[PDB]
Design a protein around this ligand. Structure first.
Ligand SMILES: Nc1nc2c(ncn2[C@@H]2O[C@H](COP(=O)(O)OP(=O)(O)OP(=O)(O)O)[C@@H](O)[C@H]2O)c(=O)[nH]1
Ligand SMILES: [Mg+2]
Ligand SMILES: [Mg+2]
Length: 331
């Protein structure tokens, strides 16, 4: 398929998505509800938003909201790292347990799950009106990477469509970590999209260190999304260039998808090698360095750490299949 063909099926596939109102207006009430609960634990605690809501400036269906609870001092330390220690984890679980209890008290019909499978303690809430959200505590790095990605998409707002196209597809194909057998989160896919756009000079490099939590909005404003006005030609051209790039230009054997620096990052300069795989264990299991995606803020975090040789196979295959189906749209 030509870029035009892909472009057109892509715009047609989103027609329902651009039908309803996109505004991040809808989050305010939920934000207020959660802050209601947070205040009962501590009226001096802050509530911040992050995740796709912030990255895009729009609120997607089938997407949760991400919240983090922060102390004043956590905010004022707007460029501090997040401790990867057992006591930090314990602090976060202690406060999240208290909050989950309040959420249950105040909302008898909500399911309030204390999720402990994870590196980062999280409370998962499903109320029913797709009132859907995760709450974490005492961490800057989610608000920070989301503000970084948001800053990138503000440079070139129509690029959000390339991104959104990749997110929906990743899930359709079973590539996205949200699906059983999935290996890369949506966050990972966004890192790849941005890295791609940077290599093509569609975006201007933003050093991750310039992002300051003390200067972000707890709840950032809406950023209007408008239909690709050129029939979707730019989108279709981007999608095909994105697939070509990740199939034929990005060298997964030698290179790391990174936003820490402009240009190429090597596996060797990170020590992200077969030798490191023998030593490297995250959350009690092997980290893989077959597909390398460097996290801009957390030390030594491969976002592609679950991409085994097999899942790497599966990704190449899908990247190939994606060309001929316009990201599973020409069916
Ligand atoms: N360290 C790390 N954090 C992640 C990863 N995936 C998601 N997160 C965190 O969670 C936040 C939102 O992640 P996601 O829910 O996967 O991304 P999203 O943009 O909200 O997309 P959807 O919820 O799938 O629509 C990000 O700011 C990340 O900090 C990951 O693979 N590694
Ligand atoms: Mg999310
Ligand atoms: Mg998530």
């Amino acid at each position: 398929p030509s870029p035009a063909v892909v472009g057109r099926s892509l715009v047609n596939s989103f027609k329902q998505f651009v039908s309803k109102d996109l505004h991040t207006r809808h989050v305010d009430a939920t934000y207020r509800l959660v802050l209601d609960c947070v205040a009962a634990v501590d009226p001096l605690m802050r509530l911040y938003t992050f995740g796709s809501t912030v990255v895009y400036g729009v609120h997607e269906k089938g997407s949760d909201v991400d919240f983090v609870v922060l102390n004043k001092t956590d905010v004022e330390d707007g460029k501090g790292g997040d401790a990867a220690t057992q006591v930090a984890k314990g602090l976060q679980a202690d406060i999240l347990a208290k909050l989950a209890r309040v959420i249950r008290q105040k909302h008898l019909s909500w399911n309030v799950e204390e999720v402990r499978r994870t590196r980062v303690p999280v409370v998962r809430v499903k109320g029913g009106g797709a009132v859907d959200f995760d709450i974490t505590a005492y961490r800057r790095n989610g608000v920070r990477n989301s503000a970084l990605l948001r800053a990138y998409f503000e440079q070139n707002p129509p690029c959000r469509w390339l991104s959104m196209s990749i997110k929906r597809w990743s899930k359709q194909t079973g590539l996205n970590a949200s699906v059983i057998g999935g290996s890369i989160t949506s966050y990972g896919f966004n890192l790849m999209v941005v890295y791609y756009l940077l290599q093509r000079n569609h975006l201007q490099f933003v050093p991750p260190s310039t992002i300051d939590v003390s200067r972000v909005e707890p709840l950032p404003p809406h950023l209007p999304l408008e239909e690709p006005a050129d029939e979707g030609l730019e989108l279709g051209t981007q999608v095909l260039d994105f697939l070509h790039f990740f199939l034929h230009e990005f060298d997964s054997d030698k290179q790391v998808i990174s936003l820490n620096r402009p240009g190429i990052t090597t596996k060797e300069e990170l020590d992200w090698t077969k030798s490191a795989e023998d030593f490297a264990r995250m959350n009690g299991e092997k980290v893989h360095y077959q597909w390398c995606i460097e996290d801009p803020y957390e030390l030594n975090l491969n976002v592609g750490r679950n991409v085994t040789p097999l899942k790497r196979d599966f990704l190449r295959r899908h990247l190939e299949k994606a060309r001929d189906t316009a990201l599973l749209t020409i069916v």
